[PDB]
Amino acid sequence: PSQRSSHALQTLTTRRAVRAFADRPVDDSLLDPMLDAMLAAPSASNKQAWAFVAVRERRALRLLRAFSPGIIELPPLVVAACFDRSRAVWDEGMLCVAMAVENLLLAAHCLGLGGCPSGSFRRGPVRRLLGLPDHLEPLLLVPIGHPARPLAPAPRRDRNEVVSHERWGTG
Amino acid sequence: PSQRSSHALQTLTTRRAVRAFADRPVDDSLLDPMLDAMLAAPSASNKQAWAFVAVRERRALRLLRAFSPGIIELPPLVVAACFDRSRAVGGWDEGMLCVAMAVENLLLAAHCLGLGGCPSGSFRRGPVRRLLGLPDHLEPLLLVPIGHPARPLAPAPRRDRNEVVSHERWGT
Amino acid sequence: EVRQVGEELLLLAAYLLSSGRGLLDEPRQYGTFRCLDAARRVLALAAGTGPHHPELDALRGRMDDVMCGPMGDHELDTLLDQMCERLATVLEDPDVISD
Amino acid sequence: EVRQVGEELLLLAAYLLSSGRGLLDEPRQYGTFRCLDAARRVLALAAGTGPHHPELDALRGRMDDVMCGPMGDHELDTLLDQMCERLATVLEDPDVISD
Amino acid sequence: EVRQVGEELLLLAAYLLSSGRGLLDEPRQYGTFRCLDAARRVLALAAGTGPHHPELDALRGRMDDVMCGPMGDHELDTLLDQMCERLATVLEDPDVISD
Amino acid sequence: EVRQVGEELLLLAAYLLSSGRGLLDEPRQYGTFRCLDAARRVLALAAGTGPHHPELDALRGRMDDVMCGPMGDHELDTLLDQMCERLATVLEDPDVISD
Ligand SMILES: *Cc1cc2c(cc1C)nc1c(=O)[nH]c(=O)nc-1n2C[C@H](O)[C@H](O)[C@H](O)COP(=O)(O)O
């Protein structure tokens, strides 16, 4: 009840992007809950219009890191989230895929790992490495792995500037 | 260690959209943690190019619902998430996805406390903008109705796992 | 009381107009879903002040389950037929509607 | 007067259900037409009972011309955006919607 | 051993090319940040096989703190100056670099 | 031979740091050119030590023509895209990268 809610809120709030990953691999028993939590995300119209790829091979990981400047260090796991154009209703449903990615980040924190989503990458070569078909278009690469260094919060603006009350400019 | 991982996994997994709100207003004590945990979402460069509006007045809520077909039932509270084009990166924009990610954190922030909602996004942008008083640079993205659930959570059918996720390739 | 109903009618009309604009971008199948959504809104308003009939409440309940509830695995050919026929049967009652 | 408003609401709801069921057979473009048709019907109910605003009468005539007038040569995306914007200004009026 | 270094050089060149293409869309300030990222990558690779110097490890650690760590509240005019000057001083050592 | 590769890597890292520091003064368009320059420098290091592929020599010649010699023109979005794509084809070869 109150303690479970408090623990969940702590888990959500303490979520910090991880750019340094230990050389430890991500086990399948540790990957399955993350995938389940990621897939349990809202969609546009219960159309599940998205595609996910779970890269774990070393060579594929190095190629993706080389072709994805957003990735900082070699990740034990990579999650390639793509928008499914065949099931699509500049797309509203493209936001739902990012919501699923966010759920995956929080799942990584659920299991003590960490993921750093990135959208700054070459779609062409990354698609070619992933082997994605024509309709699927990659939009997010999520390096996930066990953290190697302590995590610290990034500077944040005042809540008044970013959040208002019933209007704009109201505190 | 296993218990908290299990609990957080259960909280994340058992997050179902709520479209039937009850007659219980969302108190400020139930909102402050919600906004606190919602704002802890990735931002493009830490630009934090986003804006949120917390609507609770009954008049404003009715006006928003009337001009937004996405909302099904009158919500005690509404969160209008919008992209701050003032701090856009490179100038579709990637930060819009970060707005959506903060909205995901919003949904989970509502679920933990017992509240619920859906990331409604099917609304008339013009009338909603005029109602909420956004300037030119704030482009509305999502209008999430958050409120106390009145209908038991009912799971929705989902596609096969094999057809949605793959291992380092496609079709493997 | 009459003024309150009229105010809710203006918001209902704004919702219908917003739905009309929206349908130009929504997929093919929301033509009926938005009509069903509007129908239950009208019945909720009508149950407040208009004639009361037990089967009318049953209609509104079925509509609420369809929309507010889970989405998917819904058929519209038959479901809409039974709801329209039940409401037609109610309206044929000389008491619910006035000549 | 409140009871009569309710009866007309039941007829409108039945029209919304019938329009939805029919929209499956009718083409996609009729989805907006049915919603717009329902919009003017709702305003008709609120014309004699709801708040009296000059812009409301002008809007009702606009949908009346579109529907009751000759078919075709209608640009829906611009027409719906302009109309909904006008009704928005009306609803912002503190007299039109109280709370 | 030489072949492994060459393979990692090919991947590094691909990263540099991708960064070059990306900078045509990234904000103004990433021109230096991508160079710093590539610099720390090169220094990691060079520490793998090339000459060893404690100050070089210090340089790599500082770059790792800048990049892999929290982002924001970073000044580039002075930080890059100290990094470049320290690396230069190291390279001026007749032992680390060969004439 | 590995030691010499390492010393050249240290020089390349120093060049990357200097280019990053200078890019603040230089215009925005110079970021991509400095990245491309670093790309061809890295390929120069890998030319005599890394895997020998004909397309690698062709790519190095392409960058040599672009950076060296005449200045101007050299539209970068298309040019960088093409160069990086070709390097991508090179990297996928099993002989070029083992694991
Ligand atoms: C939403 C988003 C986040 C990103 C992106 C791109 C998008 C669209 N790209 C990143 C990248 O290339 N590198 C990187 O290290 N992080 C990226 N992020 C995450 C975001 O920048 C961080 O989460 C941000 O620093 C906030 O940190 P936090 O700990 O407060 O969540």
Ligand SMILES: *Cc1cc2c(cc1C)nc1c(=O)[nH]c(=O)nc-1n2C[C@H](O)[C@H](O)[C@H](O)COP(=O)(O)O
């Ligand atoms: C991601 C998303 C979800 C939406 C959106 C828009 C976006 C971008 N718009 C909705 C709307 O207008 N109305 C509405 O009722 N729901 C909307 N949703 C949520 C979506 O319908 C749910 O994700 C789905 O119905 C059920 O998902 P589940 O996880 O609860 O099974």
